[PDB]
Every structure is written in C-alpha cells, then in structure tokens.
Design a protein around this ligand. Structure first.
Ligand SMILES: CS(=O)(=O)CCCn1c(Cn2c(=O)n(CC(F)(F)F)c3ccncc32)cc2cc(Cl)ccc21
Ligand SMILES: *[C@@H]1O[C@H](CO)[C@@H](O)[C@H](O)[C@H]1NC(C)=O
Ligand SMILES: *[C@@H]1O[C@H](CO)[C@@H](O)[C@H](O)[C@H]1NC(C)=O
Ligand SMILES: *[C@@H]1O[C@H](CO)[C@@H](O)[C@H](O)[C@H]1NC(C)=O
Lengths: 428, 428, 428
C-alpha cells in the first residue's frame, strides 16, 4: 500500500508504505577452485588446455543535498581481512585438507574466524583423472571440460579487468545453486533467508568477489555477501523542490528548499537517513539500502513533514535567490516548481494538456497524468498504483522579509535562518 | 565550422559551431522471444539444451557547478509503464497471437498505447520443429541452434547482473538489423531517421532495455529508445575558470568564477542549459544531450559572454579567496588560471616550451600548441581544426574592493554581489 | 612501513609510508589488425566467416570536499590527436607497408610523431592463405581460426557498446604478451618498466583504447598508456571528520571540518594534492594516482597536520552548526565524531564492545579492533599492520566564541574565519 502526501507549504512530498531491507553487515565466505599442475577431439582438448594454462598465468600475474554529511567506510575491509589470513603458511592447506572429501565445509581459520568454505570447481581432479592418461573416444569429456574451463576463464576475465575486486557478483563467481545453498546455511532468520532467495540479483549487486590467492594448486577468492539485519520496518521517501516567491520583477524573489530529501527507514528506535537516494533500490514495496551511506537521526526528523516549524527538530533548508523552474518526479506524482516565464504543464496520453501550472510550487498525482513538462523538459511520471493526498498550506516563503532574508545558505535550517534574520534586525 | 572566443575580462571561453541532437522523449517497443517448454552432434545439442533450461530458470528467478539546480526525473518510467500493461491477463497473448505469422507488428494494447512489437527470436518454433522429433545427421542444425541459444544466454547474462535493466542496449538485446528497422518505422522525420541510423552506438547508449515478463512460453522485454525532438539547432559550450587578483601578498587576493559553464543549445525560443557537460557527447560537430539533465533559460543568458554586466540577465558567479592555479582544456585551446608561485607553460611537440604564462587568467589556442602545463599537471590540448579569437578586456575582478568583497558565495550572481557590497558600504 | 597519527585537536589523521606512482603523461601506440576482403568442418568455417563479415560491418558502422577546485582536462586528446593523423591519405599505408615483414615497428608519421605500431592479428594473411583455396581435412585450422576470429569479435563488441573508446584496456585489445613487449620498448627507466610489468591490471585501468579507422583492409585503434613520471616519492593520506563542541543544548553547538582531506604526494619540490581519493588506488604501499585530478601546492600545506595555526600556510576548513555523528575509517584505525545521543562503540571479533566513545572526536587504532559502530552504521576497519600514534591536543573548536562564529562557510580557512570573527567584533 504505497501512499503519498504533498505539502504545499514547503514544496515537498512523502511516499510511504515501503518495507526495509538494509545491509547492516557482511557475510564472508571462501570460494575455492582446485587447479592442476600440468606439463580431433584431443586437438579440441589441446586448445582447451592451452587456454587453461594462460588463465592460470593471468591469475598469477594478478598477484604480484546532504551527502557531504556522510562518513567514510572501507567497503571490502571485512573480506580483505579474511584474505590476509589465507596468506599464512599452511592456512590454505587447512581449507584444502578440509575440502578433501566434501565440497562445502565450515573451516575454523587461525585469526579466530569461522568461514563457510566452498569448492565450486574441482579442475584438479578433472585433469588428473579424465585428462592425464592421454585417446579421443567420446565427445562428452570434451564439452564437460570446455564447460568447467569456461567458468575459470570468465572468473579470470572479471578479476583482471577489475583488478581483483568485482561487483555485482556474477553467476560465474557463484552460481544460483551455490548462492542459494550459501544463503540457506547462514546464521540468519528464515525471514532473511527468504528475502535473499527471492532477490538474488539485488543480493549479487550488494556483494563483492575478492580475489585472494592462488597457492598450492588452489585458487581462492572471498565472496562478501550482505547481511540484512533490518527487515520489514517502515520506510518513506522524501522529495523536495525549490519554494520561491513569485513577484514579476526579476531578482526580487527569494527561495528556500528542504535539503533533507532522500530515503528514511525506521531502525532500532532511530531513523536511518539516506541522502543519496541512488544508494537505495526499490523492488515493488521493498527498498534495499546500505547503512554505510546513511546518517542515524532521531525519529523527530519526521516532524519536518507535518510541521517544519516544530520545536523538537531543527528542520534543514537551503536558501537562494535563484528561481529556476524544474520538476521532481515522485513515487505517485510530480512536484512542479514553476517560476518566471516558464511553460509548465501536465498531460494525459490520449488527451494532451490537462493542467497548466501557475507560478509557484504545485503538485499533480499520477492518476490520469502520464507526462509533465517544465520548459523544454518532458518527464514521464511513474505509473504506480497508490493514493495521493494534497495537503493545503500557505507556502512558508511568504512569511519572510526579502530585505533581511539570508540567501546563499546551504547547510542551514529553520533556526539558523531565524537567528540570522534576527541578527539582521539588530542593525537598527 | 567550430570556432572559439576567449573572454579575458571574465576568464571564460565559448566554443560554437555545433549542431544539436537532444533526447526530448522516448520511443517504447516490445521485444519478444518465444520459448519452448521441453521435458555426438546430439550430445552437443544435449549440452546446448541444458544451458537453455537454466537460462530460462535464471529469467524466471529474475522475476519474483550548477547541477544542484536540476530537477529529478524517473528515467525508465515510460518503459516500465508499458511493462505493467503486459502483466494483464491475456495481454501478452494479444502480442503472441498478433505475431503468429509475422515478426513485427503494431499491436494496440489495452491502456491506450500502440507499441511496435517485434519477435526477434523464435526459439519455440525451432525446438518444436528441428529439435523435438529427436537423430544426429547434419552439423548445421547444431550450430544454428548454438547461435540462437547464445543470444538468449547473452540477454540473460545482461539482465541478471543488471537486475533487469540495461544501458547501453547491446546488439544481443537488439541487432543492428532490428534497430535499423525499428528506426525506419518510427513516426519521425527523415532527418531524424538518418541521424539515428548514422549514430547507432550513440542511440544504444541513450537507450534502455527493460526486462518485462516471461509468461506463457514468451519472454518480453521493453526497449526504450531516444526521441530527438530537437535537431540541428545551434549549440555552444561555455568553459570557465577562476579569475583572481594577483597581489604578491598571500591571502590578500579575491577571486570570482563564472558558474554557468556547460552546454547550451537553442531550443524552441529558449535555451537548454546542461550544467553537467558529461550528460552531452560530441560527435564531430554534432552534440547529443538529454533534456532531462537541463534547465530551460531565457536566450538572454548568452549576453553573459559578451557583457557580464548586462541589464537583461543576472549573470551567475561564485566568489572565493582561494587562488589555486589550474587549467581548463577547451574545444580549440586552453584557459590558464595561474597564481602564486606556480609554473605555467604551453608547449609544442618538437619544440618544447613556447609560452610562459604570467599570473592571472590567460588563454592559448591549439594552433602550434600540443600540451599545457600548470604546476605538476600536464594537459594535452584537443587537436580540432577551427578558428580562435582572443577578446581583450580588463579582468573584472579588478573592479572590486577586497575590503568589502563577499567571498565564499557559491549560488551567487553579479547583482547579489552588488547588493552585498552595497550592504557592506551601509555600515559607515 | 605504514604509520598513522591522529590529531585530537583537529579531528584528523595522517597515514604515511606510501610510495608514489603518478600518471604524468601518456604513451600512445597504434594497434593494427589486417583484414580480408572476401566474396562439416567447412560449415564450421562458414559460420565463423559470416560472423567475421558482420563484425567488419559493425566496425564500419561504428565510423560514420575540494574537488570543485580542480581544472578540467581532455583525457583522450593525445590518443585522438594520433588518430586524426591516420585519417590522412596513404598514412595508414605507411604503417601497412612498414609492417609488411614485421609485427612491430616504430613508424615515423606525418605530423611529427613517432609511434610504436603493432600488428597484433593478421586475419588478412590467414584468410588469404589457409582459407581462400577452399576442403575439410584437419580440425586444427577450424579452431585456430575461431580463436583469431574471437579476438576480433570481442574487440568489436567492446567498441560498439562503448562508442569506440574503452577503459580499462582488455586483454582482447592488447594481450599480456603484447603489453609487456610494449612496456619493454618504451623510452622509460627500468624502475618504471618493472613498476608497470608488476601491475598490468592497474596499468590497463589507467589506459584507453581508441578506435581510429578501418581503411584499406586495415583496422587501427590507438592504445593510450600511462607514463609514470613520478615514482617512489613519499605519499600520505589525510583523513578528516567534523569537530564540534558538545553542549547538551541542541543547536547551541559549533563545528569545523578540515576540508583538505585526500591524497598527498611529494612531487618536484611541491606537493600533488588529490581531493577525490577515489582517483588514487593503493596496492600494498604503492599508491597509483593521476595528476589530472590534482592541485599543485606548496609543501607547506603539510604544516596543517602538525600546526593548523601556522603562519606559512592558511589551512582550509569549513564551518557548520550541524553536529551529526559519523566515522571515517582510516588506513590503520578509525576516527569517530560522536555527538548528541548517538551510540558510538568499537569492538573486537570474539569479545564485542571494548570501547564506548563519549561526545566529541576520538580515534582508535586497528590493533584489537575489528569493527566500529556509530548509530545504526557498522564499519569494518582495515586490518593493515602498522603503528598508530595518538597525538593529544585541545580540540581547537573550543577556542571560538559561538556568538560570533561564522557557520555555513565552505570554501574557508583559518584566516578567513579569523577576519570574519574580527569583522563581527567590529560591530560594538
Ligand atoms: C559533495 S560536496 O562538495 O562536499 C557538497 C558541498 C555543498 N556545500 C555548498 C555548495 N557548494 C557545492 O556544492 N560546491 C561544489 C560544487 F561546485 F561542485 F557544486 C561548492 C564549492 C564551493 N563553495 C560552495 C559549494 C555550500 C556548503 C556549506 C557547508 Cl557548511 C557544507 C556544504 C556546502
Ligand atoms: C529571535 O527572536 C526570538 C523571539 O522569539 C528571540 O528570542 C531571539 O533572541 C531572537 N534572536 C535569535 C538570534 O534567535
Ligand atoms: C547599490 O548601488 C545602486 C547604485 O547604482 C543603488 O541603486 C542600490 O540601492 C544599492 N544597493 C543595493 C542593495 O543594490
Ligand atoms: C584580527 O585580529 C588581529 C590581531 O592579531 C588584527 O591584526 C586584525 O586586524 C584583526 N582583523 C582582521 C580582519 O584580521
């Protein structure tokens, strides 16, 4: 149930009804491919083997508005931390020996980590059985080999053009089969296992493959998978657009814009705020975000939608004198900031222009509306089903005296502006 | 005929002679691949069929300075709007039944859209004819199948690692043949058809492939192609760089920079302004932009190049006290902002340093010049043929008193600065 | 020997011990593939030849905080400059005729350039010998052809989906073999040759492939490779985070942040400063940067780490009143800016929370620490071995009176703030 409210007084809109899936952590696992140390259908194998030899060579060669408020993480530090351990002597042999008679196992490593290790491809035992004695005979060994070899080559290609770190994680790095099994064996809730299983492509996109080592006939890379420690909490998206006075004299106008646009998700008694809404992806009513790109705010930040002048949170805005027209396409409609001589319209498919916007900040829902045009820019609106509510209010920019209005404030708020205006009235 | 003028008084340059190709809209079409529901050269087919089976599985699994002034669109809303319709019951059967005896057809869909539908691959009729009865015989059916199957796999790979939305649109999604035919059948001018046909790679880059549905032996994805509703209008690129006073005392200097740099194209009586010049691509003298990343301004914005103090448009600038050196490589030359103790030079290939810049903002054309060096940074200049004109003028930063100069203004203009300076002179 | 110092007085840290590898220039070379003009195992060749024909068709069709202070280069201007020369009549024939009996040669071109030219694939002599007379016989010609043809197709695919410019440079554009030979024949020091040879993937990432021409049975593209004119100079990374007062009253607090974060490398008597630390890549203790994304500063910029109030350089800061919590993961630890009611902790793997941060800016090294948590955000810390030093000092934000503190300054410095504060004290 996606709904939306437009706030006329502050030229912003809030889309709600979303459920969260936030990456809160990482799950690291070691993926191994055992390699072989070597020297008509045979000539096919000859070629297939030469390519094997230089893929191995390649792998060996491989190892010789409010965004500015965010902190800075190190995205593959967990995975790299695991990799640095595989570089201890005999450490890959602990993995090697544990995966002797089994393809997947939980190996207790040295530094005090217990990682699910997984041998996805046993080229070693292939070459050292159905290859070594040669003897043409059957074509089925030729194609089974080309198949296993191809995975190797695709892994090698990805690592080389990406300097050993890839994202999203391909099906060559980790098949649907293996990923599903990995998902099934993680120390997580069932609600989490099913979430991941029904969204593997989103999972792959939030994952890393990290080339670790190729030592003692063994290729090891670490796959770093998202932990969704916050699921099914309410999320909402806040859209904002410039609110300006609409005097006919050019340059006599003042504007303010709510700078706190982005994604918001309830999270452990606070709210996770994602200023760069590209760090989140929406699947139906589920929104996948990453906590690394967020701020943790008091829940009172939401009072800025209902009352931007509330005493519990100092709502954030920027100020300018630059009244350009534009539109923001929301979840269930469109905000239009229309100023000057700009032609601003909304249209239906078969009927054309159905609404002409006058100067100021207005809004239209997506019911019956397919496109929106501001100046020379045509925006298609999203055709998501959901109810829209227009909340009438006096545009707050009307409450300010342009003679003492502080323009060109960026990292500002309702209070900071009040203090300045008052500071300006002190000069009398 | 590419020309260029440098304005000494404002440390900016304008490259003109370009012709426009602006994406103003979208053309949506439905691409279908009919699928089959199933169970030495045959063993080849066996493998080729197993890969078919899990590609289908993968697809099913798949479905379970002035940039801050821009508005915010929803780039694939038109395509997704078409997709939501294919999810109506029997709606893909309207497409299916219409493409019974033909590969391309204009199917009138339910929601009041008429989309060109296109069956690019008929795997269904391949498996259910030259495959089902099996019977080795000829190798030509093996390779014709691997070929058709490969397209499927490549489409599947792109959709999975991109969560069902790809751009640019590959030749696997849509061949040169099919694209050309699609281009040929669109309700557009010939000037537009030829523009697209002579720039398919640019077209592909401005296009989207959107995975829609895999229902009733049919795979459907929507290809979203650019409409160039503005062609062959004059475009010009504005380059800007910091203009500072050059006093020898550190920290006693003031700077201003024109913030209105970017691409400009004449468009329907106004001017389309593209602040993020990476949203535009130049092919020879043709410049491909996207109106979604633009502002619509009065044509008077161009008066800022000839006269930044003009009364018809309030030209935009920022102010600082930070006189670092740098260079901007233009279309036909280079702007050099040289301050402090920085070594700034221009050079020819075989002759080395030919010009040493003194402190301030200067310019050199690309005739005889191959490189430009500011400090430890070497820039190669573009070697495009075209005439360059140096327009002499007193640097306007000399007209300002540093004692009342407002520095650290970002979203500013000539007037805003005047009002502030005057506001500062009021304290006397 | 990577070390790190945290400065408590300014909430910043400096990681040192790094060695430089800066791209200072470009090395351009011409890569050619000679093409053929044409018309069971033969049917294999038939298919392989049809794909050849349309790859050629595709290629022919193909040719018809302080970042805002950076200048603007033109990244492939050197390579494109070389390309414009190959478009002179008979100019590719100079290359063609010179590569008659040899695969690599230094061809003196017209415009006064001498470029190493390299024929990596001779399809012409393949088709016009082991193909033309046909005659099935041996399978080894089939697979040797598919192999050579495949490279062609992969090159063609990359150029088409990238509009003729690719980066990083694939092994299909240029094999490890060819790249190593190219590296070996460049007019560079041995220290440089070995640097490149031990980091080909980094090299490929800093390279461009530029499709030039397909004329007279010859395909030519220009490969643009990095020149590392600065090697083995000391580099250091500066991390910064917001420093705020910690009064319990909301909105009564003031903050400052050092804006000069990024990479620093000693370079020719000055310092190269890279504000966008993503323009640099770290391999062990080697850091690869690009001078195009840098400023050239006096070496005195480093005094801001030991003494931000020094008289030799005006250290840069921004100011605000926005005391949000966050963390910056450094090379050997973590900076924590903890304000308001935010829960801030550091943890060990097997032991959990080991340190709770109080309000203000603090730091913890990576020894014994694996994760850091600020609010709802968990950051893994880097597990690099190296010594960390905590430098105690009074947080400088305590030296300022909030009543005359200038907040919302972005492009500011210690002096600019002093002048403003003093300017504010003038109103008495
Ligand atoms: C990603 S980021 O760059 O860190 C955001 C910075 C945005 N920002 C601005 C507005 N502003 C820019 O956006 N840029 C950068 C650009 F030019 F790219 F827009 C500025 C260059 C100088 N002065 C003000 C600039 C004023 C301001 C004031 C405070 Cl206290 C904090 C942040 C602020
Ligand atoms: C602003 O006005 C309020 C009146 O409500 C007053 O209390 C305050 O002192 C004034 N000045 C500032 C800087 O807030
Ligand atoms: C600035 O100077 C002009 C004089 O041309 C005057 O008209 C104006 O009132 C002054 N002040 C402002 C804020 O523009
Ligand atoms: C600031 O204070 C210093 C005192 O050290 C004084 O010299 C200076 O004139 C004052 N004002 C400015 C704008 O620097």
């Amino acid at each position: 149930n996606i709904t939306e409210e437009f706030y006329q007084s502050t030229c912003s809109a809030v889309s709600k009804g979303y459920l969260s899936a936030l990456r809160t952590g990482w799950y690291t696992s070691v993926i191994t491919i055992e390699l072989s140390n070597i020297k008509a259908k045979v000539k096919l194998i000859k070629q297939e083997l030469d390519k094997y030899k230089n893929a191995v060579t390649e792998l060996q060669l491989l190892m010789q508005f409010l965004g500015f408020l965010l902190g800075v993480g190190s995205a593959i530090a967990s995975g790299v931390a695991v990799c640095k351990v595989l570089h201890l002597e005999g450490e890959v042999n602990k993995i090697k020996s544990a995966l002797l008679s089994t393809n997947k196992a939980v190996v207790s490593l040295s530094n005090g980590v217990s990682v699910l290790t997984f041998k996805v491809l046993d080229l070693k035992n292939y070459i050292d059985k159905q290859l070594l004695p040669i003897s043409i005979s059957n074509i089925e060994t030729v194609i089974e080999f080309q198949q296993k070899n191809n995975r190797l080559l695709e892994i090698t290609r990805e690592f080389s053009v990406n300097a050993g770190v890839t994202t999203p994680v391909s099906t060559y790095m980790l098949t649907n089969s293996e990923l599903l099994s990995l998902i099934n064996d993680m120390p997580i809730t069932n609600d989490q296992k099913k979430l991941m299983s029904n969204n593997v492509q989103i999972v792959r996109q939030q994952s890393y493959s990290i080339m670790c080592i190729i030592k003692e006939e063994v290729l090891a890379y670490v796959v770093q998978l998202p932990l969704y420690g916050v699921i099914d909490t309410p999320c909402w998206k806040l859209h904002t657009s410039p609110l300006c006075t609409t005097n006919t004299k050019e340059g006599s106008n003042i504007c303010l814009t709510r700078t706190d646009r982005g994604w918001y998700c309830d999270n452990a008694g606070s709210v996770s705020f994602f200023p760069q809404a590209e760090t989140c992806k929406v699947q139906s009513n589920r929104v996948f975000c990453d906590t690394m790109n967020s701020l943790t705010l008091p829940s009172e930040v939401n009072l800025c939608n209902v009352d931007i002048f509330n005493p519990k949170y100092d709502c954030k805005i920027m100020t300018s004198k630059t009244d350009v027209s534009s539109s923001v396409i929301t979840s269930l409609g469109a905000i239009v900031s229309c100023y000057g001589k700009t032609k601003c319209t909304a249209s239906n498919k078969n009927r054309g222009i159905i609404k002409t916007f006058s100067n100021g900040c207005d809004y239209v829902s997506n019911k019956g509306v397919d496109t929106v045009s501001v100046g020379n820019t045509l925006y298609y609106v999203n055709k998501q089903e959901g109810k829209s509510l227009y909340v009438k209010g006096e545009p707050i920019i009307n409450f300010y005296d342009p003679l003492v209005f502080p323009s060109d404030e960026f990292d500002a708020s309702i209070s900071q502006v009040n203090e300045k205006i008052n500071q300006s009235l002190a000069f009398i």
